[PDB]
Design a protein around this nucleic acid. Structure first.
Lengths: 332, 91, 76, 91, 57, 188
RNA sequence: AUGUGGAACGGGGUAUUGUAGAUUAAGCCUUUGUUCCCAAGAUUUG
RNA sequence: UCAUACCGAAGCAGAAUUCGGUAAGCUCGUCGCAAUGGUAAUUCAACUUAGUACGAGAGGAACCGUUGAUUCAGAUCAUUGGUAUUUGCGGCCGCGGAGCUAUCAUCUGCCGGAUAACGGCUGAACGCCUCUAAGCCAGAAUCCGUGCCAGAAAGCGACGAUU
RNA sequence: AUCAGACGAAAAGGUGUUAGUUCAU
């Protein structure tokens, strides 16, 4: 409790991470996304040569105890227009999607089954019946706006979680003009967004999230800083855990699933440190507010070997396939 | 002992000073608007700044002199530095 | 990048996992699991435990780097 | 001394007569006979091992152990006369 | 210093504008002294007044 | 022995295993000192985290038998960087200071007294020399050149203080000038 | 609050200890397996 | 206000620094905005820089990168050691997976201006000069911003359904 | 006044003013 800033330490109400401060944008910057909702797939120590001129580990093999985040693609079904006012930053209007997925419709509700599935139905009528009204809303946004964000939601069904309400949160469309921001939002409407496009594996990411409660330590929304990305592995990619050095094919998921999380079947990212919250918890990955110019972010990442052993218990083999031939024929 | 290297950029708008008494960090000074700085070939290591605003020229000269200041060194012993030599009307 | 062999469990020793011990006689011992390290500490005979592969069974020049050599190594 | 690359208090094997498998500390020839981190020599070289393997040696050069495993570092042997007696071969 | 300072002065010398600035600063020193006499506070104010009175007398 | 830049430490010879054709160099340290160490295949590799070839590679122009305690992958990279005639052998011996315990010059391999005959032959085979087990820092105390001058500011480690090539030698920045001249006379 | 419906087990996987066995997720994963209940039960709400 | 951050003065050769101050840092919802507070880190180093400006030389420059040592906070149990109601297991022991915890582990941790001291440039009074009376400034671990932490239970906006 | 004023360190200093007086040129 030394840090007076956190005192009085009280648990964050919203489990989902909140992007309180988006990075500054400019017209020259292309329209793109900063914050990406994700889940704590797990964490695993992986070896990597440390390429840093002037460092004492310069071109030296060092094991990197790091963390892997489950990041399913990002479907966007809404846009918000924020207009700057003397009182503050006010939302001019919200334009959701003509067709909303079941998951995002579950978010608006507390339960899906008891209700008569009436979430945004009459809206879906006026959107389809009168597209010109939506055009006026977009026209109103373009003429009067400085900040434009999108109401993108997660696909829970792709994730191995009992969660069914799609986690939704505004993401600024940084770059370009407001009209250009709206044009990109309108064309990417009702479309998924992959985190691999958002982060180039070398860009600077400050992960924000809510930590794990303890029997007011825990459920604290805390913004981690200086956690560089090393690999955005795809779910369909069977070579994500097998880099150039370790060409032996393997999946980031340890055999028998991650510890207290499950298996990973979607896009995942790679970063060091520890993220606030245990496995299978909602996390937000956003671009850094400040352009961190330290050589830790500047240095290229050439990961040497991913580990996938049975972290639960004591795993002596990272993948079953090699252990089949390495160890003798089983009695079965 | 160590000669000072002067580089002109943006038609003399930006002046870079390097190797100032062995310094490995280059000092960059931006001149005020309406003032152009050039290196005169008549006198070696001579910089001539011409402009229409006398105050801007004087401020630019003071900034250049302040940038090339000896720190933690004897003024009497170490006399290296950049100072204004002469000033007057262009025409 | 070479996978070491466990001294007790006679299994592969991945980086990070396991325990590595150095003896006074310049001997390096690797354990694939904490149980193997505990067994080695307890002076358990590797041939006396059927879990180890040693009991079950009993019951360096460098070359010039080349593309063809790498291909031959990949084939092997 | 009779004539710190790794993190503080790292598990360093006492190569000296102490013979500890992993004693709290580190860089080779720094005492510390060996370490995971490279000991950047002033002559532009390095010195390290697979993990921390720092032998027991007092700051005054009177090494606690006189049975340094393998060859002790020549810089360590020169800095610590007992380390030279610990291992006749000075690395 | 001393012999070294004299040798440096004979060989290199010193900036003449600094001497002109020092003379200009000398005039500013008189203005600063008047300002300092009006800016001294606490015990320093009594010490400055005592020093000024002693210098005047 | 020509004085080479080695910063504070005078043991440039331990850092770099100078030789006519296998002048192994120093890596992971001062850039200026490492360049002087390179100045004859400059094998500047931190094999096993140790780039002190003159203290960990028993050999000469014909090749340096680096200790097997050093990483094989880095040694293989050093061998690839080194010329093909220079054989980077592995000295699997208790004395990990191959260069510093064995003065494996090209003409004669002054191996460590603690080093076994097979280890002595390995250093001799790498440097194409005759194995001779002698004290056990023969490489450090005696320059490995194909005059017992106390190199490195009077230090008893002459070879460690001043590197000796097969046809030349390289002293440290702070190495004794008289010893370096003596090493030059010994190395002709 | 009638279907990836969930909840349970039957488990598998799983590592543990340990000399293979049992627990086998309990905050390890997971189930083309099974049954149960339920297109709820009330309350609040202009 | 001991050190330190900042500079000024002093031979202060440089290192080593000292002193001077400045400086208290140490209806039901769904999704957002931020009035207001606390508070971005925090204490210091060495190598590189340069093994050199200075300096007879040696010892050692500003700035740069690196290695860091911390405190505190932020995390997590992957690495890490245990605790461990798998109290699970084999023979009361031998221990223990998961989970959690750690100066017991692995780790991550700020900002740009205003200016203070402080020294200015230019420029009156005092045809000039003159940190200054007009102006333009440089310059601080300070302050303010900033970032983070909350969120006006009696703040607000957008959007959905609506007995 | 960048502590006014308004309702003892206090004596004095002020490149602090306001009115200025007197005396020198």
């Amino acid at each position: 409790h030394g840090s007076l800033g956190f005192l009085p330490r009280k648990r964050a109400s919203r489990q989902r991470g909140k992007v309180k401060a988006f990075p500054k944008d400019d017209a020259s910057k292309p329209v793109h996304l900063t914050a990406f909702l994700g889940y704590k797939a797990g964490m695993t120590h992986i070896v990597r040569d440390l390429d840093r001129p002037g460092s004492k580990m310069h071109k030296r093999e060092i094991l990197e105890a790091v963390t892997v985040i489950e990041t399913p693609p990002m479907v966007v079904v809404g846009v918000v227009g924020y207009v700057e006012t003397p009182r503050g930053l006010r939302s001019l209007t919200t334009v959701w999607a003509e067709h909303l997925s079941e998951e995002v419709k579950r978010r608006f509700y507390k339960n899906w089954f008891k209700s008569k599935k009436k979430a945004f139905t009459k809206y879906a009528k006026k959107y389809a019946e009168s597209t010109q009204s939506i055009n006026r809303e977009l026209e109103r946004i373009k003429k009067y706006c400085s900040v434009v964000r999108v109401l993108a939601h997660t696909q829970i069904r792709k994730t191995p979680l009992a969660q069914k309400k799609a986690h939704l949160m505004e993401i600024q469309v940084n770059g370009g003009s407001v009209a250009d921001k709206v044009e990109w939002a309108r064309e990417h409407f009702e479309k998924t967004v992959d985190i691999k496009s958002t982060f180039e594996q070398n860009e600077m990411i400050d992960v924000i999230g809510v930590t794990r409660g303890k029997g007011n330590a825990g459920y604290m929304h805390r913004t981690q800083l200086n956690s560089k990305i090393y690999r955005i592995g795809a779910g369909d990619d069977a070579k994500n855990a097998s880099t150039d050095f370790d060409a032996t094919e393997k999946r980031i998921t340890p055999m028998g699933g991650f510890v207290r999380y499950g298996v990973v079947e979607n896009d995942f990212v790679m970063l060091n440190g520890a993220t606030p919250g245990p496995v299978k918890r909602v996390l937000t990955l956003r671009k850094s507010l400040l352009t961190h110019t330290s050589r830790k972010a500047l240095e290229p990442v050439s990961l040497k070997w991913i580990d996938t052993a049975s972290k639960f218990g004591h795993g002596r083999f990272q993948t079953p396939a090699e252990a089949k031939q390495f160890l003798g024929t089983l009695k079965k | 002992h160590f000669p000072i290297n002067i580089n002109l950029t943006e038609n003399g708008t930006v002046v870079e000073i390097r190797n100032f008494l062995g310094e490995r960090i280059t000092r960059v000074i931006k001149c005020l608007p309406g003032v152009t700085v050039s290196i005169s070939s008549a006198v070696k290591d001579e910089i001539i700044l011409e402009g229409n605003s006398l105050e801007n020229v004087s401020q630019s000269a003071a900034n250049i002199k302040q940038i090339c200041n000896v720190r933690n060194k004897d003024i009497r012993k170490f006399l290296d530095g950049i100072y204004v030599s002469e000033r007057g009307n262009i025409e | 990048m070479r996978v070491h062999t466990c001294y007790f469990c006679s299994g592969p020793v991945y980086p990070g996992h396991g325990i590595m011990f150095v003896r006074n006689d310049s001997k390096v011992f690797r354990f694939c699991r904490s149980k193997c390290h505990k067994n080695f500490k307890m002076k358990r005979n590797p041939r006396k435990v059927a879990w180890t592969k040693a009991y079950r069974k009993a019951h360096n020049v460098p070359v010039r780097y080349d593309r063809n050599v790498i291909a031959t190594t990949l084939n092997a | 001394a009779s004539g710190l690359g790794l993190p503080v208090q790292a598990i360093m094997n006492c190569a000296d007569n102490s013979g500890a498998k992993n004693l709290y500390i580190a860089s080779c020839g720094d005492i510390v006979v060996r370490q995971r981190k490279a000991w950047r020599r002033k002559d532009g070289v390095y010195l390290y091992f697979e993990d921390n393997a720092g032998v027991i040696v007092n700051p005054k050069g009177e090494m606690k152990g006189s049975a340094i495993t393998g060859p002790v570092a020549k810089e360590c042997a020169d800095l610590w006369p007992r380390i030279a007696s610990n291992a006749g071969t000075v690395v | 210093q001393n012999e070294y300072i004299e040798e440096s002065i004979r060989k290199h010398g010193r900036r003449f504008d600094h001497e002109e600035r020092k003379r200009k600063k000398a005039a500013r020193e008189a203005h600063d002294a008047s300002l300092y006499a009006q800016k001294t506070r606490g015990i320093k104010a009594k010490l400055y007044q005592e020093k000024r009175r002693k210098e005047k007398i | 022995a020509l004085r080479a830049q080695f910063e504070n430490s005078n043991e440039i010879g331990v850092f770099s295993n100078l030789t006519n054709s296998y002048a192994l160099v120093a890596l992971g340290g001062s850039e200026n000192f490492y360049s002087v160490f390179e100045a004859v295949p400059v094998v500047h590799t931190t094999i096993g985290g140790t780039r002190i070839i003159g203290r960990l590679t028993c050999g000469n122009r014909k090749g340096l038998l680096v200790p097997s305690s050093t990483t094989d992958n880095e040694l293989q990279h050093l061998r690839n960087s080194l010329p093909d005639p220079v054989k980077i052998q592995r000295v699997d011996e208790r004395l990990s200071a191959l260069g510093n315990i064995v003065a494996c010059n090209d003409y004669v391999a002054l191996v460590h007294p603690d080093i076994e005959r097979e280890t002595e032959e390995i250093i001799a085979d790498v440097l194409d020399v005759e194995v001779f087990r002698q004290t056990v820092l023969t490489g450090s105390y005696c320059a490995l050149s194909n005059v017992a001058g106390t190199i490195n500011r009077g230090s008893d480690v002459i070879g460690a203080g001043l590197v000796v090539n097969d046809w030349c030698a390289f002293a440290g920045l702070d190495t004794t000038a008289t010893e370096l001249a003596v090493c030059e006379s010994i190395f002709k």
